[PDB]
Amino acid sequence: FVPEEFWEVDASTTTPSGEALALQVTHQNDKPFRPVNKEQTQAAVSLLEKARYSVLEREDKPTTSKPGAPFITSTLQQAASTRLGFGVKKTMMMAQRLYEAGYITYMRTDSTNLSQDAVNMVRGYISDNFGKKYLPESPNQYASHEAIRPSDVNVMAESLKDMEADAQKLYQLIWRQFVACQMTPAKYDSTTLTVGAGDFRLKARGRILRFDGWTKVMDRILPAVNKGDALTLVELTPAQHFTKP
Amino acid sequence: PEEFWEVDASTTTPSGEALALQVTHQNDKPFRPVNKEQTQAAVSLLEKARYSVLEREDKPTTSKPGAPFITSTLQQAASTRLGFGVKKTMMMAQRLYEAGYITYMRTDSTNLSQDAVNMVRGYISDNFGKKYLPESPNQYASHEAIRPSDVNVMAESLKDMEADAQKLYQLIWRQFVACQMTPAKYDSTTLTVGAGDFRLKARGRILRFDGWTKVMPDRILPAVNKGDALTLVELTPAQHFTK
């Protein structure tokens, strides 16, 4: 594998009211902005430094995010790696121990299916511990033996006195994914700002949580600015990156 | 944990054949040292003794099969023979039941239905032979026992089950078929040896008819008679702890 070099440019600006607004340069000449070396970035930066910044478009809309499916072997490995920093073989050793102790279901599966007993169990837990608004009218179904889930939803990670810290973290991950998969969607009020500067286009995205839904068990607020408003550039910050395997 | 020792004695018969012995008594009382000093004291004595066969008992023996599984005995057998914990065993048994491969897994009864008895006796007659089939169905001290739903379904055929689930089904299947088969027969032997203040023993048996062990799978003591002199080769002490 050969790492590919690419640069990104962020711009700190101030709204007419004086509030801070962070932007990411996305386009240059209507084409995706992605310089590959320092000189190219510097050339772009020199242009952005003199350009006039103005809000081209502001889009506000409600959005929802649904929970993910309960774990299968491949998704558990991916999540344990991303969230906990566990390698695949370590994740599988720990999952096998949790299964052999009877804490979770069989760990080698490619099915997201959940038995009626498991659905009854988790929906009861949700009704008792979270509330009616967190419970969908009908069980949530997922594209797809059974998924990897706790054997007893009433058993919490901290109660596994026979497991070391990382094993408890893995159980907690499995437990949270399973409970969340049967909860209602999270609701947000999203905002997207599009800014123009010379032959450059920049953007900022933000959202405000209206209902937590599944996120209760398991980006920022953009300042007020309308279309046509002028933004004052404060600082440009280029960043060098390299792709990974 | 309680520390206790044992002592094994390797000897040779007049013909020169090896004979392994275990020390069982000392001064007519059960031998069971609790430390290294006690054991070493016994070893020094055994090292200077004359060894001779005090008695040889040869007799036929019988081994009957066990009852079909109930929840508690399945858990015990899965632990002892397969190394499965209780929770794991019950999770797998539940899946086998839900798939329809075995009968309900929560039971305290060793009873078998007339249909199940007819089915397994037919299997035995077809696959093992008349000497493996008792005149009347075998009865056991005691809903129904945990058994396969279809005796013609072999563990190897459960494509939808992982290896350990197949091992569990195999265990249940073998226990069920064996429980309706005839006793195994052996010719047993017990050698009692005298060595100074100690008594040592060796046990052996030869299979004469496999019976139930045919579906659900010791030593052969060398030829020696009462009065035969034995030559001590080596004494081997062993330290143990209760678990």
Terminal CA-CA length for chain A: 7
Active-site residue flag, A106 = yes
Closest residue, chain B, to A146 (C-alpha):
B95
Helix (H, G, I), strand (E, B) or coil at A190: strand
CA nearest neighbour of A43 among A30, A54, A28: A28
Q: Under 8 Å CB-to-CB from A28, ≥6 apart: which residues?
A: A44, A199, A200, A201
Residue A141 gets which letter from DSSP?
A: -
The DSSP output letter for A81 is I
A102: left (phi over 0), alpha (psi -120 to 50) or beta: left
Instruction: Name the catalytic one among B51, B101, B104, B123.
Output: B104
**What is the rounded CA–CA span in Å between residue B132 and residue A57?**
88
**Placement of tokens 């932007």 in the chain:** A23
What is the DSSP secondary structure assignment for residue B181, as one 8-state letter?
A: S
Give the domain-ending residue among A135, A157, A184: A184
- Give CA–CA dist A81/A67, Å, rounded: 19
Instruction: Quickly list H helices, A101-151.
Output: 116-129
Spatial contact of B189 and B181, defined as CB atoms under 8 Å apart:
no
> Do residue A73 and residue A108 come from a single domain?
yes
In angstroms, rounded to a whole number, what is the distance separating the alpha carbons of residues B122 and B120? 5
- Nearest-angstrom CA–CA distance, B62 and A102: 39
Closest alpha carbon to B92 in A73, A147, A102: A102
| Range A79-106 burial, b when 16+ CB lie within 10 A, else e | bbeeeeebeeeebbebbebbbbbbbbbb
Contacts of A102 in chain B (CB under 8 A): 85-88, 90-91
CA–CA separation, A108 and A96 (whole Å)? 9
A93's tokens: 């050793």
Q: Which of B134, B166, B182 lies at the terminal end of a domain, its last residue?
A: B182
Same domain, yes or no: B172 and B206: no
Q: Nearest CA to CA, how far is B8 from chain A (Å)? A: 37
Give the residue carrying structure tokens 């009020």: A189
Distant-in-sequence, close-in-space partners of A195: CB < 8 Å, separation ≥ 6: A13, A23, A53, A54, A55, A56, A201, A202, A203, A204, A231
- Give yes or no: residues B53 and B80 share one domain: no
What is the resolution of the experimental data for this entry, in Å?
1.8
Instruction: Report the domain count for chain B.
Output: 2
Q: Is there a single domain that holds both residue A215 and residue A152?
A: no
Regarding whether B70 and B177 lie in a shared domain, the answer is yes
Tell whether A165 and A83 lie within a shared domain.
yes
Q: Which SS3 state, helix, strand or coil, does residue A22 take?
A: strand
Pick from B48, B50, B47: nearest CA to B234? B47
Across the interface, of A102, A103, A108, the residue whose CB is closest to B162 is A108
CB B188 within 8 A of CB B201: no
Dihedral over alpha carbons B132, B137, B143, B148 (to 10 degrees): 20
Q: Which of A112, B70, B212, B149 is nearest to B157 (CA)?
A: B149
Minimum distance, in Å, between the CA of residue B42 and any CA atom of chain A = 43
> Which run of H or E residues covers position B178?
helix B163-178
Q: What is the CA radius of gyration of chain B?
A: 24
- Domain boundary (A158, A184, A210) is at A184
The Cα–Cα gap between A89 and A110 comes to 17
Residue A151: list chain B partners with CB under 8 A: 87, 91
Beta strands B51-63 and B229-241: pairing type? Answer: antiparallel
- The CATH number of residue A107's host domain is 1.10.290.10
Amino acid at B12: T
A160 and A196 belong to one structural domain: no
A107: closest chain B residue by CA: B162
Task: Return contacts of A96-100, CB within 8 angstroms, 24+ apart.
Answer: A97/A163, A97/A167, A98/A163, A98/A167, A98/A170, A98/A171, A98/A174, A99/B88, A100/B84, A100/B85, A100/B88
Chain A positions in Cβ-Cβ contact with residue B88 (cut-off 8 Å): 99-102
Between A and B, how many residue pairs show a Cβ–Cβ distance under 8 A? Answer: 21
- Say which of B86, B91, B160 has its CB closest to residue A151: B91
C-alpha B12/C-alpha B16 separation (Å) is 5
Report yes or no: B179 and B135 within 8 Å, Cβ to Cβ: no
Among A100, A106, A151, beta carbon nearest to B85? A100
- CATH number of the domain that residue B229 is part of: 2.70.20.10
Q: Do B85 and A99 touch (CB under 8 A)?
A: no
Distance between CA atoms of residues A36 and A42, nearest Å: 11
CA distance B87 to chain A (A): 5
Residue in A106, A125, A134, A188 annotated catalytic: A106
Please indicate whether, in this complex, the C-beta atoms of A101 and B87 are within 8 angstroms of each other.
yes
Q: Are residues A32 and A130 in the same domain?
A: no
Chain-centre distance of CA A85, in angstroms? 16
A179: left (phi over 0), alpha (psi -120 to 50) or beta: alpha
For residues B74 and B145, is the Cβ–Cβ distance under 8 A?
no
Q: Is A139 found in the same domain as A90?
A: yes
- Chain A residue closest to B98 (CA)? A115
Range of the domain at A214: 5-66+185-243
Please state at what angle helix B86-98 crosses helix B71-82, rounded to 10 degrees: 120
Q: Is B9 helix (H, G, I), strand (E, B) or coil?
A: strand
Alpha-carbon distance A151 to B116, whole Å?
32
3-state secondary structure (DSSP) of residue B57: strand
Q: Are residues B8 and B21 in the same domain?
A: yes
Main-chain phi, psi angles of B16, to 5 degrees = 95, 10
For A159, how many CA atoms within 13 A lie in the half-sphere containing its CB?
Answer: 8
Q: How far apart are CA A199 and CA A177, in angstroms?
A: 45
Report the C-alpha gap between B75 and B85 in whole angstroms.
8
Closest listed residue to residue A53, CA positions, set A215, A243, A200:
A200
Report the length, in residues, of chain A. Answer: 245
Question: Are residues B104 and B141 both part of a single domain?
Answer: yes
What are A129's two structure tokens?
Answer: 């511990």
Q: Sort B189 into a burial class: Cβ within 10 Å, 0-12 / 13-18 / 19+.
A: buried
* Nearest partner of B172 among B69, B65, B67, judged by Cα: B69
Quick one: which of A67, A9, A81 has its CA closest to A233? Answer: A9
The residue type at A25: V
CA distance B174 to chain A (A): 24
Tokens found for residue B224: 């020696």
Residue A151 sits in the same domain as residue A212: no
Nearest by CB to residue B88, choosing from A99, A108, A145, is A99
Strand segments, DSSP code E, in chain A are 5-14, 20-28, 31-32, 53-65, 186-197, 200-211, 230-242
